[PDB]
Ligand binder design. Structure first.
Ligand SMILES: C[C@@]1(F)[C@H](O)[C@@H](COP(=O)(O)OP(=O)(O)OP(=O)(O)O)O[C@H]1n1cnc2c(=O)[nH]c(N)nc21
Ligand SMILES: Nc1ncnc2c1ncn2[C@@H]1O[C@H](CSCC[C@H](N)C(=O)O)[C@@H](O)[C@H]1O
Ligand SMILES: [Mg+2]
Length: 259
């Protein structure tokens, strides 16, 4: 039994009050109250991010874990937070977004932050059925939390199998969400993937404590077992400590205008 699997077992045993207290304890979060009201009014020129994903992907890029450029493919774009942030980067030529958009899923949102005119967001697209294309930056944020590790592991592996066909085209940069990296099989799978495509797993502090999600980014180089184990220790430690306040930060503002 791994530490992450122990974390998942402990998480499922929490009561509602225990879980919600632990979910945001000590995590970093961007303030989106201003963004929510502006978006609901239909404001598209205020620079607001359509979701908290823009801050997530910026945290990785600002620290040099990937440098988006060329043609960017955003698989599972949802509202489009990754695509809108990717559209503001120097060497990005265009951003192609795809998302399933089902009953519980998200539909693309149309805003006019900087570089909006080089973005195409398409809804109703299941990426498991579309053919892999060559690209320069491969983005994927797919994987849905579940109570059982078996479902999370299965969902993660299906994503990685689909992503492997895109990575065979060898994009220069990638950022792939790994919902469940904490099983021995998943650690083994990532090791083979890292040997073949490089990169490494990174834990973003904006992530909630209720998910073990890590991001496979081309710029990272750390060991996979150490990366997952260190993250599992952090999540386990926050369980047995008193509730720590949320570290709030200003949300990302992406400006306005065409490129
Ligand atoms: C069922 C889950 F495993 C979810 O799969 C995971 C992420 O749930 P989440 O809040 O991060 O959701 P999201 O997808 O929006 O991000 O936490 C667990 N979980 C959710 N509610 C509760 C609860 O009451 N009690 C306990 N013990 N576990 C809970
Ligand atoms: N098979 C699939 N094909 C395409 N999109 C999928 C998918 N399974 C899940 N998704 C979508 O992937 C999205 C992951 S949420 C990520 C949102 C985005 N990173 C942002 O910054 O806003 C969800 O909205 C979900 O609808
Ligand atoms: Mg979750």
């Amino acid at each position: 039994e791994t530490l992450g699997e122990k974390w998942k077992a402990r998480l499922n045993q929490m009561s509602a009050l225990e879980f919600y207290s632990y979910k945001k304890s000590g995590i970093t979060e961007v303030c989106r109250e201003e963004a929510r009201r502006a978006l609901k009014d239909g404001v598209a020129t205020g620079g607001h991010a359509v979701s908290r994903g823009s801050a997530k992907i910026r945290w990785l890029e600002e620290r040099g874990y990937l440098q988006p450029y060329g043609k960017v493919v955003d698989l599972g774009c949802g509202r489009g937070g990754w695509s809108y942030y990717a559209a503001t980067i120097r060497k990005v030529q265009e951003v192609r977004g795809y998302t399933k958009g089902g009953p519980g899923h998200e539909e693309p949102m149309l805003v006019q932050s900087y570089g909006w005119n080089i973005v195409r967001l398409k809804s109703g697209v299941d990426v498991f059925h579309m053919a892999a294309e060559p690209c320069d930056t491969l983005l994927c944020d797919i994987g849905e939390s579940s109570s059982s590790p078996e479902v999370e592991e299965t969902r993660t592996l299906r994503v990685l199998s689909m992503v492997g066909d895109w990575l065979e085209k060898r994009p220069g940069a990638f950022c792939i969400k790994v919902l469940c990296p904490y099983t021995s099989t998943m650690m083994e799978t990532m090791e083979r993937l890292q040997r073949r495509h490089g990169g490494g797993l990174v834990r973003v502090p904006l992530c909630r404590n209720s998910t073990h999600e890590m991001y496979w980014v081309s710029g990272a180089k750390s060991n996979i077992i150490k990366s997952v184990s260190t993250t599992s220790q952090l999540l386990l430690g926050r369980m047995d400590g008193p509730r720590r306040p949320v570290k709030y930060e200003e949300d990302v503002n992406l400006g306005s205008g065409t490129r």
